[PDB]
Amino acid sequence: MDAHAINERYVGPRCHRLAHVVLPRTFLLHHAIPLEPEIIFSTYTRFSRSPGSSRRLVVCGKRVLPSPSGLALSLPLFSHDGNFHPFDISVLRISCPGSNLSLTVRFLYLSLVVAMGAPPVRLSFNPVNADVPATWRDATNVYSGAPYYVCVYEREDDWLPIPLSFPEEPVPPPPSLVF
């Protein structure tokens, strides 16, 4: 549970919003993710109805030893021109530095955006802390069908929900635009 608060200071500013995600073992058994501390995570998102690429970011992940239990991560969310797209895939790429291992884990924003909804001078000292409490909210992955947890940490905020910009007609069917 340290990897959420680490990423808000190093991956946090380089994004627009973060998607704090904890993966249970039932998700880990399906995608076959062998939990070693050597693992380097890399994240990028695949846009739709636009030129689709975002930059690649390295996200730190740590095993949580026990109320859920499993791998803890943080996914980047990108807001081009002030809003989110609903059908917009965030891809998690898992790889080891030495051996032959490459895994692609894919998430959709509507499973994340909905899940977020409820004299000498002074130098400041702001260390990383797990003091902020977590609110565990359920979710399901659309692509695999394995549940994963989403944290909501406490901090024009309570007035507005999270902005979404649904696609406009003419549109292909969203069973065909998701895949």
Binding site: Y10, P37, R55, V58, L123, S124
Partner: protein, 145 residues
């Protein structure tokens, strides 16, 4: 410090006060005494530029160096020294500079951090062990670098 404010007040005069500047940069309180200094510069026209060309590369530097150093086996002291950096430096988004531009902002950056630090740890110095005031005699021994 005085040579920097000689260049600030040459372009924008309202930021430098002569009552503030020539009051704490002309007296040196050392060894229970003060000393007057005769200053109207040309000798320090590179340290005022080497310390200032280093002055903006440090805030970008100490976040690019900390995003690369994060792992299970971080040295535990930098858990403390992560908080001393101000909040505005912690929001530098390095997307606005490319990766073959960032290398040019490191080999420049490290080279001033050494070559400014070395010229004060250069030691043609000598340790006086005996002295008299009204005769101006002194003995010592020398130790280079």
């Amino acid at each position: 410090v005085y040579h920097i404010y000689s260049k600030i007040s040459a372009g924008a005069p309202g930021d430098v006060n002569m009552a503030e500047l020539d009051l704490y940069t002309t007296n040196v309180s050392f060894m229970g005494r003060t000393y007057r200094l005769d200053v109207d510069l040309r000798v320090l026209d590179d340290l005022s530029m080497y310390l200032c060309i280093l002055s903006a590369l440090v805030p970008r530097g100490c976040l690019r160096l900390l995003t690369a150093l994060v792992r299970h086996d971080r040295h535990p002291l930098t858990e403390v020294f992560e908080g001393v950096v101000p909040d505005e430096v912690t929001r530098i988004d390095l997307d606005q500079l490319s990766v073959p531009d960032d290398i040019t902002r490191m080999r420049v950056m490290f080279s001033y951090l050494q070559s400014l630090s070395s010229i004060f740890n250069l030691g043609p110095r000598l340790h006086v062990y005996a002295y008299s005031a009204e005769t101006l005699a002194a003995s010592c021994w020398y130790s280079p670098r």
